[PDB]
């Protein structure tokens, strides 16, 4: 109970440093304390009641910076602090947690288009790099399920990819899965009752409504019920069972609609707006 829906940093015009909440039960927002640095194209995890706001880039009037930011929020002070950094700045990243360790997968340092994958333990605050990707992957969506990382689409530096991968810990090794049907770079992916979805993304002509359900047991993608607006660069988390897409570009617009998918029915409702549009944020849920 009282679990929130938080989105970090994002893009309009430049780079955000916002910080809000949302609370699917009374439909509220919460205007928290701005990230130190504004980012966009990060990634948010939570782990053991703390939020993490991991790389992204800083895109200023100025110029841009990629991040090998970690930074963490603690609800209970409303305060960032700064933690260890990755060993590379890592835009349009990927983040899943296991067992208490943060993974950073791939992203994109100015023309470096990492396939390299690092580990995060908050107890030693320190980074380590494990098994790369078979794919360089920016613009990747990241999953854990079943104790493995899934890491799904994103751009490999030539191809956009409809390609999916999955990672073993234990082993530190990586496994290329059963494409998507579709190619996507920007996508929303979550898990919600033992399925993968990525929804949204770009692949590489027009940004997408559609949305692919990853079913372990086939090891199958399959289409499920469209969101209402196409749109890549969307945050995603999941909530009570529902799937929420919060933001992104629609291809003319950074939108401000939040959208919810109910597995039980195969449908997308408009839940709520964002206080602004902005696409590339970092979303989570404690
Ligand atoms: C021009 O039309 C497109 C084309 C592909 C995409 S994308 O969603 O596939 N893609 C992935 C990839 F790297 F693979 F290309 C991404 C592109 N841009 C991002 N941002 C930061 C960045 O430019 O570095 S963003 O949210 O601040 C942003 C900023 C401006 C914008 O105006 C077009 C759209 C987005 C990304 C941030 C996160 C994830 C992917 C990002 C988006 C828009
Ligand atoms: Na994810």
Same mark, same amino acid.
């Given at each position: 109970?009282?679990?929130?829906?938080? !989105?970090?940093?994002?893009?309009?015009?430049?780079?955000?440093?916002?910080? %809000?909440?949302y609370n699917p039960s009374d439909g509220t927002w919460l205007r928290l304390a701005d990230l130190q640095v504004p980012r966009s194209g990060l990634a948010g995890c939570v782990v053991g009641g703390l939020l993490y706001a991991v790389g992204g880039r800083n895109n200023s009037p100025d110029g841009n910076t990629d991040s090998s =930011?970690?930074?963490?929020?603690?609800?209970? !002070?409303?305060?960032?602090?700064?933690?260890?950094?990755?060993?590379?700045?890592?835009?349009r990243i990927g983040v899943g947690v296991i067992d208490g360790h943060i993974? =950073?997968?791939?992203?994109? +340092?100015?023309?470096? +288009? +990492?396939?390299?994958? %690092?580990?995060?333990?908050? %107890?030693?605050? %320190?980074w380590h790099l494990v098994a790369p990707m078979l794919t360089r992957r920016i613009g990747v969506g990241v999953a854990v399920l079943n104790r493995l990382l899934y890491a799904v689409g994103g751009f490999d530096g030539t191809n956009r990819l409809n390609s999916a991968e999955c990672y073993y810990p234990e082993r530190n090794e990586w496994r290329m899965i059963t494409a998507?049907? !579709?190619?996507?770079?920007?996508?929303?992916?979550?898990?919600?009752?033992?399925?993968?979805? =990525?929804?949204?993304?770009?692949?590489?002509?027009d940004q997408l409504n559609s949305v692919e359900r990853y079913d372990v047991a086939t090891a199958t993608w399959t289409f499920v019920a469209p969101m209402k607006h196409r749109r890549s660069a969307l945050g995603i988390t999941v909530h009570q069972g529902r799937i929420y897409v919060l933001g992104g570009y629609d291809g003319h617009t950074f939108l401000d609609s939040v959208e919810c998918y109910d597995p039980d029915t195969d449908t997308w409702s408009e839940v709520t707006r964002m206080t602004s549009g902005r696409s590339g944020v970092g979303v989570a849920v404690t």
């Amino acid at each position: 109970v009282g679990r929130l829906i938080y !989105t970090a940093g994002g893009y309009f015009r430049q780079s955000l440093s916002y910080l %809000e909440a949302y609370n699917p039960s009374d439909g509220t927002w919460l205007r928290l304390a701005d990230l130190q640095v504004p980012r966009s194209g990060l990634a948010g995890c939570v782990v053991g009641g703390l939020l993490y706001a991991v790389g992204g880039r800083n895109n200023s009037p100025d110029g841009n910076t990629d991040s090998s =930011a970690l930074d963490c929020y603690n609800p209970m !002070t409303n305060q960032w602090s700064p933690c260890a950094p990755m060993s590379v700045p890592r835009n349009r990243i990927g983040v899943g947690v296991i067992d208490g360790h943060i993974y =950073a997968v791939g992203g994109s +340092h100015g023309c470096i +288009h +990492h396939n390299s994958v %690092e580990r995060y333990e908050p %107890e030693r605050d %320190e980074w380590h790099l494990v098994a790369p990707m078979l794919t360089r992957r920016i613009g990747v969506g990241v999953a854990v399920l079943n104790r493995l990382l899934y890491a799904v689409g994103g751009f490999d530096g030539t191809n956009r990819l409809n390609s999916a991968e999955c990672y073993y810990p234990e082993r530190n090794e990586w496994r290329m899965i059963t494409a998507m049907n !579709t190619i996507r770079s920007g996508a929303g992916v979550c898990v919600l009752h033992n399925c993968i979805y =990525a929804a949204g993304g770009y692949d590489g002509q027009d940004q997408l409504n559609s949305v692919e359900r990853y079913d372990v047991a086939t090891a199958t993608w399959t289409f499920v019920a469209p969101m209402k607006h196409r749109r890549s660069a969307l945050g995603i988390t999941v909530h009570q069972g529902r799937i929420y897409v919060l933001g992104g570009y629609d291809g003319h617009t950074f939108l401000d609609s939040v959208e919810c998918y109910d597995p039980d029915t195969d449908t997308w409702s408009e839940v709520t707006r964002m206080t602004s549009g902005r696409s590339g944020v970092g979303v989570a849920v404690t």
